[PDB]
Amino acid sequence: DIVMTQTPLSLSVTPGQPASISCRSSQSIVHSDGNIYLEWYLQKPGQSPKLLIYKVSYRFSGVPDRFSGSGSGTDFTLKISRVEAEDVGVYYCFQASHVPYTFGQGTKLEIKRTVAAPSVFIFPPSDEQLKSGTASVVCLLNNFYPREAKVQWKVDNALQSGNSQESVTEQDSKDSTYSLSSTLTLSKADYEKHKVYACEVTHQGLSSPVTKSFNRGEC
Amino acid sequence: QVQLVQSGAEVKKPGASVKVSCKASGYTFTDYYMHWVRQAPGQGLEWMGETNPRNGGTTYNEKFKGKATMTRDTSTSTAYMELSSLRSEDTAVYYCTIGTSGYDYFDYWGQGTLVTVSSASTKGPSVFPLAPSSKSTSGGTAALGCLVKDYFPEPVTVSWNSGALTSGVHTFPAVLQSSGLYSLSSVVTVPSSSLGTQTYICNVNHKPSNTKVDKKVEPKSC
Ligand SMILES: Cn1c(CNc2ccc(C(=N)N)cc2)nc2cc(C(=O)N(CCC(=O)O)c3ccccn3)ccc21
């Protein structure tokens, strides 16, 4: 099978600046008809890939003029003249000149926007969950940049360990930010031993940590 | 107009079979070859084969030959991909795709079907509201959401107000818990001024357990 190798593996570009992605085929990709069936696709998380360029250099209908393809032999390149927020995701090259048709491993494009501090929100466990014998406390870190935001849980100012789980979103296609969710999970019995539940947030955009807290039973 | 609607996610035991469907609309079914593409982290995106909708013949990728059996029903404009003798390594997202300009490109894709191969039985999630309160406001913005806890396998989809509310929505990637079950949260930021007039419902779908939950997130008077 023809191996399609993409370089670089990842790219971080400031809005309005160019982006270049290379795709190298392990063999020639000239179809018996004489054409080179080399395509470029953009895939966003949870979504199907979307066609950008076909037959090396042809721009698919509806794709912005900032996208262009070039190449010959075994060396193909995708170019973005000026990157926009909407360009985030994973770029894949693909050959359909020889069976089996093969895809590249992918190149992740990150948009290098300005620093944005997170907005912090806290949710006590719901009354319906407390009826079941479990208590989940949610701390939301919203629309920040860069992705490195640290969350620490404190229960009556005592630093917690091993009772929380977090998840970061993909980079937003509109504002180039990330959001993070952290969940503290305790039994109703452990939950009832303490009063002050706090999530402390550290980030590049915060000169000093931001703490959001509540007193158990006050709602 | 051109649509490719695939069957929902399924959990299957090792050694069992699974038939994924791809319902085509908005074009004459017999005009274009139907393709199946696998996506698994590691091996990445792989083209499995192409089915001729006229004669029903499939040109397979050697790697998927035998393992995958592709068919088409011209009476229902539906293409099928059947995987037999399922193994852990078959866990992946399976897409159907078509090319409308000869064999130049793939312009239309289905939404994908996640097939999970496991001995663990399906588990439907519990849905808990993340009610807006004084503790979840920032300026004139209120955050609210839903906590989707203890499901297996992936995925869960979350929409807000049957898809009418999308702006400021963040449905977080699932987290694997110690129990082997998954959890996720879906949040939205809205004006705090209109919490008294607007209604916010999270629509939670877990296709492998046939779970459909609609949860109205009521503001907290705290
Ligand atoms: C191998 N191949 C494919 C595979 N699709 C494909 C899509 C995209 C890509 C890609 N991503 N590059 C790669 C492959 N589609 C083909 C269409 C024709 C064709 O011209 N006709 C018209 C015949 C008439 O005049 O009726 C046709 C139509 C229906 C059935 C049979 N033949 C010939 C060969 C074809």
Side-chain angles (χ1 to χ4, degrees), chain A residues 1-160 162-219, chain B:
Chain A
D1 308 355
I2 302 160
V3 178
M4 306 298 286
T5 307
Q6 295 177 218
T7 55
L9 260 53
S10 193
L11 213 44
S12 191
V13 182
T14 301
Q17 292 307 286
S20 188
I21 302 161
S22 287
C23 172
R24 185 100 173 247
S25 59
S26 66
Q27 296 167 38
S28 60
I29 52 162
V30 181
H31 186 281
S32 292
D33 72 23
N35 294 337
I36 297 162
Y37 294 97
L38 193 282
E39 294 127 67
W40 289 99
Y41 293 89
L42 171 55
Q43 185 181 36
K44 286 158 179 283
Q47 290 183 47
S48 311
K50 281 229 161 202
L51 176 68
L52 298 169
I53 305 288
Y54 68 99
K55 287 198 284 169
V56 185
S57 53
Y58 299 88
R59 189 163 48 246
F60 181 57
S61 66
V63 175
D65 57 42
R66 70 175 174 277
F67 293 92
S68 68
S70 72
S72 50
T74 59
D75 270 275
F76 308 91
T77 316
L78 178 73
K79 299 274 193 201
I80 312 173
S81 66
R82 296 191 168 189
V83 313
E84 299 204 357
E86 293 62 42
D87 306 339
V88 282
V90 180
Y91 291 88
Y92 296 98
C93 64
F94 164 87
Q95 75 80 19
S97 299
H98 305 292
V99 170
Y101 313 151
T102 54
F103 291 89
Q105 83 292 353
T107 298
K108 182 161 270 285
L109 170 68
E110 182 188 340
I111 305 303
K112 209 189 275 159
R113 61 148 290 158
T114 61
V115 177
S119 296
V120 187
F121 308 90
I122 197 168
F123 303 88
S126 65
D127 291 327
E128 34 266 274
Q129 193 192 12
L130 289 161
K131 286 291 297 177
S132 78
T134 302
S136 296
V137 189
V138 181
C139 184
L140 168 69
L141 275 66
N142 216 42
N143 312 340
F144 57 90
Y145 190 86
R147 78 183 89 186
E148 307 79 0
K150 302 281 169 287
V151 188
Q152 289 192 300
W153 282 102
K154 295 197 268 179
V155 174
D156 290 322
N157 207 41
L159 177 65
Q160 300 295 283
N163 42 11
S164 68
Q165 293 192 279
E166 48 169 51
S167 180
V168 62
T169 59
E170 64 271 22
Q171 189 167 35
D172 190 271
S173 49
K174 316 265 173 286
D175 69 8
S176 313
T177 68
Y178 300 89
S179 288
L180 187 142
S181 202
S182 182
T183 309
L184 184 62
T185 305
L186 273 74
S187 58
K188 194 193 169 76
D190 279 3
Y191 179 65
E192 281 167 6
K193 295 166 183 179
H194 319 284
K195 182 186 178 181
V196 189
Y197 285 86
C199 69
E200 182 200 68
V201 172
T202 303
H203 185 257
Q204 201 193 319
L206 303 169
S207 54
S208 291
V210 167
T211 303
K212 257 55 203 166
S213 70
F214 67 90
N215 306 318
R216 167 196 50 87
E218 255 177 37
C219 301
Chain B
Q1 290 309 90
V2 173
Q3 291 212 299
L4 297 172
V5 179
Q6 305 183 214
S7 51
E10 289 176 60
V11 62
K12 287 285 179 191
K13 298 197 178 296
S17 291
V18 69
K19 200 182 194 183
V20 178
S21 69
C22 179
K23 196 183 113 76
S25 55
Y27 72 96
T28 301
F29 189 66
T30 56
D31 281 11
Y32 315 116
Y33 274 70
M34 183 62 77
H35 305 253
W36 291 89
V37 172
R38 189 177 72 170
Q39 196 170 34
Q43 298 279 262
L45 285 163
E46 294 184 275
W47 170 91
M48 305 170 68
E50 60 188 31
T51 308
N52 182 338
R54 287 159 196 187
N55 68 25
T58 302
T59 293
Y60 293 91
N61 176 344
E62 185 54 38
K63 196 169 168 173
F64 299 93
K65 202 180 173 181
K67 161 67 75 185
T69 306
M70 300 159 208
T71 55
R72 103 277 175 236
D73 188 3
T74 47
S75 67
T76 60
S77 287
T78 309
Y80 301 96
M81 194 282 294
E82 184 171 44
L83 293 164
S84 53
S85 301
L86 290 161
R87 58 168 200 164
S88 174
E89 292 92 322
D90 298 315
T91 298
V93 178
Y94 293 85
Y95 292 100
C96 60
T97 183
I98 71 163
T100 75
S101 171
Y103 49 85
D104 296 337
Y105 49 68
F106 296 139
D107 47 333
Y108 296 100
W109 296 71
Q111 81 283 21
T113 301
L114 172 57
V115 168
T116 306
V117 183
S118 184
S119 292
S121 306
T122 188
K123 198 195 165 292
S126 282
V127 179
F128 299 113
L130 294 171
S133 77
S134 65
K135 296 300 175 177
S136 56
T137 61
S138 174
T141 296
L144 59 103
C146 284
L147 173 63
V148 185
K149 207 183 187 290
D150 304 333
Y151 61 95
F152 183 80
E154 279 210 75
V156 293
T157 60
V158 189
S159 69
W160 283 89
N161 295 344
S162 305
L165 174 58
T166 62
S167 307
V169 172
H170 301 122
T171 302
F172 289 94
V175 292
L176 181 66
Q177 308 179 131
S178 299
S179 59
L181 302 173
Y182 292 90
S183 277
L184 68 71
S185 285
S186 178
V187 302
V188 59
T189 47
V190 297
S192 57
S193 72
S194 64
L195 291 174
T197 58
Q198 307 315 108
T199 296
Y200 301 111
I201 305 156
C202 69
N203 323 103
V204 179
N205 257 263
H206 186 239
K207 295 259 182 198
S209 61
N210 296 296
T211 301
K212 270 192 166 187
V213 177
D214 293 310
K215 176 59 99 169
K216 189 169 135 72
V217 177
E218 294 268 34
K220 215 85 190 195
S221 285
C222 194

